[PDB]
Scaffold this active site. Structure first.
Site, mmCIF file in Angstrom:
data_model
loop_
_atom_site.group_PDB
_atom_site.id
_atom_site.type_symbol
_atom_site.label_atom_id
_atom_site.label_comp_id
_atom_site.label_asym_id
_atom_site.label_seq_id
_atom_site.Cartn_x
_atom_site.Cartn_y
_atom_site.Cartn_z
ATOM 1 N N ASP A 17 1.108 -1.044 0.146
ATOM 2 C CA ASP A 17 0.287 -0.319 -0.084
ATOM 3 C C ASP A 17 1.330 1.373 -0.144
ATOM 4 O O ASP A 17 2.335 1.283 -0.276
ATOM 5 C CB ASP A 17 -1.160 -0.262 0.772
ATOM 6 C CG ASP A 17 -0.146 0.609 2.025
ATOM 7 O OD1 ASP A 17 1.055 0.384 2.731
ATOM 8 O OD2 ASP A 17 -1.065 0.189 3.716
ATOM 9 N N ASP B 131 1.198 4.290 1.938
ATOM 10 C CA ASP B 131 1.013 5.100 3.511
ATOM 11 C C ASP B 131 1.331 6.701 3.736
ATOM 12 O O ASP B 131 2.195 7.052 3.439
ATOM 13 C CB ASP B 131 1.196 4.436 5.017
ATOM 14 C CG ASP B 131 1.368 2.900 4.882
ATOM 15 O OD1 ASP B 131 -0.115 2.942 5.174
ATOM 16 O OD2 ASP B 131 2.886 1.991 4.680
ATOM 17 N N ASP C 269 -3.108 4.399 2.743
ATOM 18 C CA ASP C 269 -3.678 4.793 4.029
ATOM 19 C C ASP C 269 -3.781 6.449 4.197
ATOM 20 O O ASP C 269 -2.771 6.903 4.038
ATOM 21 C CB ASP C 269 -2.928 4.081 5.147
ATOM 22 C CG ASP C 269 -3.575 2.384 4.978
ATOM 23 O OD1 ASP C 269 -4.829 2.257 4.763
ATOM 24 O OD2 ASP C 269 -2.577 1.496 6.053
HETATM 25 O O1 LIG Z 1 1.079 -4.066 13.261
HETATM 26 C C1 LIG Z 1 0.988 -3.232 13.056
HETATM 27 C C2 LIG Z 1 0.853 -2.758 12.039
HETATM 28 C C3 LIG Z 1 2.317 -1.426 11.289
HETATM 29 N N1 LIG Z 1 2.728 -1.063 12.307
HETATM 30 C C4 LIG Z 1 3.014 0.848 11.349
HETATM 31 C C5 LIG Z 1 4.401 0.303 10.781
HETATM 32 C C6 LIG Z 1 4.126 0.202 9.559
HETATM 33 O O2 LIG Z 1 5.320 0.579 8.763
HETATM 34 C C7 LIG Z 1 3.515 1.037 9.581
HETATM 35 C C8 LIG Z 1 2.827 1.170 7.927
HETATM 36 O O3 LIG Z 1 1.891 -0.398 8.252
HETATM 37 P P1 LIG Z 1 1.788 -1.040 6.807
HETATM 38 O O4 LIG Z 1 0.735 -2.163 6.816
HETATM 39 O O5 LIG Z 1 1.400 -0.350 5.079
HETATM 40 N N2 LIG Z 1 3.401 -1.951 6.361
HETATM 41 P P2 LIG Z 1 4.386 -1.407 5.968
HETATM 42 O O6 LIG Z 1 4.225 0.203 4.638
HETATM 43 O O7 LIG Z 1 5.633 -1.179 6.815
HETATM 44 O O8 LIG Z 1 4.732 -2.553 4.553
HETATM 45 P P3 LIG Z 1 3.777 -2.937 3.593
HETATM 46 O O9 LIG Z 1 2.960 -1.482 3.171
HETATM 47 O O10 LIG Z 1 4.529 -2.721 2.210
HETATM 48 O O11 LIG Z 1 3.256 -3.972 3.446
HETATM 49 O O12 LIG Z 1 2.854 1.164 10.823
HETATM 50 C C9 LIG Z 1 2.639 -1.379 13.160
HETATM 51 O O13 LIG Z 1 3.564 0.046 14.109
HETATM 52 N N3 LIG Z 1 2.046 -2.152 14.259
HETATM 53 MG MG LIG Z 2 -0.593 1.061 5.843
HETATM 54 MG MG LIG Z 3 2.513 0.516 4.117
#
Ligand SMILES: O=c1ccn([C@H]2C[C@H](O)[C@@H](COP(=O)(O)NP(=O)(O)OP(=O)(O)O)O2)c(=O)[nH]1
Ligand SMILES: [Mg+2]
Ligand SMILES: [Mg+2]
Ligand SMILES: [Cl-]
Ligand SMILES: [Cl-]
Ligand SMILES: [Cl-]
Ligand SMILES: [Cl-]
Ligand SMILES: [Mg+2]
Ligand code: NA
Length: 334
Positions: free
Chosen positions: A193, A195, A258
DNA sequence: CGGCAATACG
DNA sequence: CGTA
DNA sequence: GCCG
């Protein structure tokens, strides 16, 4: 090698990719079985390998490494000696693992829901699609857009979506800013995604922002799905979990986006939390509480003895409050 | 054993 | 229950 | 699963 992931740099790419990937399969499988302790240990051990300065080629090099006990060391021993770990391979091939992985990767589905579905005998996406009245609106959206949401988000997608969000935010509130956060801020080339963290330099002006932003995005026909959460020192930020329609040459694809809005006073805490990684933040919060006696979350850092919140003007401030060497986002890939 | 990050929102 |  |  320090015990906590927040005490060491962890780059996106490293020297033990194969070993870490195997341990992360076991972590993921532990999670599917509701073994959150085991998941955490396998995640930590994998992260320790990511932080190493060179490849592990012999079992002796694990000596003294934190989070490597009998089980994790055996996995690495087998990979070193045979190129595969039989336990990992049995997990990979198993109907239970593959089905839980399939179900839990649907937006709106967690381990408990995937497990219930599995126990009910369901195995495929089409099985779920044949029972629509049982699905939440979020799950319906996750299934509707599953193929697209399974497609890696690329940097070009991020750049396009950032322009869209910046335009809408700028239309909704003069002077508001948009900051890319999550995995792309840590240097990731692809993601699940995008963010974004939104704020405004005049404290309070950011209040009541996302309905205006979302209205303006919907008027451009860009929003396929969204779920808004109102804001509550603030202990909850306004958030919107969205699925955007992203134009592509001659077509389009759905992308998860997000949005979160924080008051500028709390922006550094929000940025730290939303930049991740997930393991990095769990480790950082564990370190804060257990080593420094301070309570950290996405909204602030609390001294329970003095009963005061720390002010922070930057992530650098927060690392300093915690007595940790600063790590840029690119080194938070725990 | 006791712990394992965080938590209001819907 | 699920969401970052 | 690992730590203390
Ligand atoms: O359980 C969680 C989930 C997310 N987070 C924080 C860290 C994460 O990097 C950020 C964004 O959540 P995402 O689910 O979007 N993960 P990220 O951007 O790191 O990787 P991707 O979106 O590519 O899976 O929110 C937490 O602290 N605990
Ligand atoms: Mg996210
Ligand atoms: Mg993300
Ligand atoms: Cl467990
Ligand atoms: Cl990547
Ligand atoms: Cl948040
Ligand atoms: Cl900052
Ligand atoms: Mg126990
Ligand atoms: Na999911």
């Amino acid at each position: 090698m320090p015990a906590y992931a927040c005490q060491r740099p962890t780059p996106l790419t490293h020297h033990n990719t194969g070993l870490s990937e195997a341990l992360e399969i076991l972590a993921e499988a532990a999670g599917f079985e509701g073994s959150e302790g085991r998941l955490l240990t396998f995640c930590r051990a994998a992260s320790v390998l990511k932080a190493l300065p060179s490849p592990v080629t012999t079992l002796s090099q694990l000596q003294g490494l934190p989070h490597f006990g009998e089980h994790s060391s055996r996995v690495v021993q087998e990979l070193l000696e045979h190129g595969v770990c039989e336990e990992v391979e049995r997990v990979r091939r198993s109907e239970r693992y593959q089905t839980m992985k399939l179900f839990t990767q649907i937006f709106g589905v967690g381990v408990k829901t995937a497990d219930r579905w599995y126990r009910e005998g369901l195995r495929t996406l089409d099985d779920l699609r044949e029972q629509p009245q049982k699905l939440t609106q979020q799950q319906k959206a996750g299934l509707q857009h599953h193929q697209d949401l399974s497609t890696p988000v690329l940097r070009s997608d991020v750049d396009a979506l950032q322009q869209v969000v910046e335009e809408a935010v700028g239309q909704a509130l003069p002077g508001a800013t948009v900051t890319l956060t999550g995995g792309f801020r840590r240097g990731k080339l692809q993601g699940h995604d995008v963010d974004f963290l939104i704020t405004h330099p005049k404290e309070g002006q950011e209040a009541g922002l996302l309905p205006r932003v979302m209205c303006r995005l919907q008027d451009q026909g860009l929003i396929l799905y969204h779920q808004h959460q109102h804001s509550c020192h603030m202990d909850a930020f306004e958030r919107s979990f969205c699925i955007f329609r992203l134009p592509q040459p001659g077509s389009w694809k759905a992308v998860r986006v997000d949005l979160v809005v924080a008051p500028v006073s709390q922006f550094p805490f929000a940025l730290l939390g939303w930049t991740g990684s997930k393991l990095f933040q769990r480790e950082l919060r564990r370190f804060s509480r257990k080593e420094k006696g301070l309570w950290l979350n996405s909204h602030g850092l609390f001294d329970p003895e003095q009963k005061t919140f720390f002010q922070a003007a930057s992530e650098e401030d927060i690392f300093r409050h915690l007595g940790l060497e600063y790590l840029p986002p690119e080194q938070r890939n725990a």
